[PDB]
Design a protein around this ligand. Sequence first.
Ligand SMILES: COc1cc(CC(=O)O)ccc1O
Length: 326
Amino acid sequence: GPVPSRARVYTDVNTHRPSEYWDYESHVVEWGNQDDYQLVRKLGRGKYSEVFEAINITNNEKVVVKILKPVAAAKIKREIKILENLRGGPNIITLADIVKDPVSRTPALVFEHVNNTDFKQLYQTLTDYDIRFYMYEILKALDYCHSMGIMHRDVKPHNVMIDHEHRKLRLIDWGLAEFYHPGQEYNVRVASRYFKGPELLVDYQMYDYSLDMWSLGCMLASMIFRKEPFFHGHDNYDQLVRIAKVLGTEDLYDYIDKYNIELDPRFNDILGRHSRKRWERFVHSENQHLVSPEALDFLDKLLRYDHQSRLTAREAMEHPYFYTVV
Ligand SMILES: COc1cc(CC(=O)O)ccc1O
């Protein structure tokens, strides 16, 4: 069977804490007043919620209301506990209230408002300096949540809200987040296709905070190379082949051999044999001003098959790529 794995940082952060911190099932939700909020417009609808722009009538301030779909109780308590645990942390969205929606009869989470723009609206037009600046801001959020024993598991441009005018960033949508417990096997059906780490794609369940670092590398590659998405898979299987056409198949086999993982046999007819490509293959006249030797070295240290070999969030903050950032 598979070889076990453990995070190389923040391994035992939950083990030493009282059960109150991480046992979300036992958490008692403190309800606010639903009449304090007036819904203004629907922003979007996903698999588990409907999101609205609203106004807090007690202070005339703009807020965002996420009304959860009646799909599951466990997911709701987990998200609430995580948001309350991380509240006030650097670049973490602030949960302002939790009210019972009168129509859906489900919880409605009330958040601070950032801007009607997600990072996906801006990330393909930033300057070199702004890519470094905002990447450093995302790292502050990731090191904080990892230091608090939490993995986000859905890092992607849509989950980074940016107020470009005020140079402010928030990491949102903690609905897939989980507490890291060493030796725990987790569900691999997390993160969006293009940002899924190889551990999810090869069905390795004992993953950790390092999954968020792969997703962050995918965002960086997309920004510096002006290729969205960087790894453009047609489904979860082709997603791994797209990665192997860049990182090569030999390092993929070394990864699965290290953890004694057996690839799904469906890969026998689609994976092939691919050499590792040099990062310079992705540089062209249109993205060259975003590429530097420091950006390429940093990217190379995030996009590694072996989750234990990737930079941690704190090591990433130490990288030369960020030396120019004030
Ligand atoms: C679209 O803006 C926001 C979206 C969300 C949604 C979430 O955290 O799941 C929270 C706060 C926001 O400001």
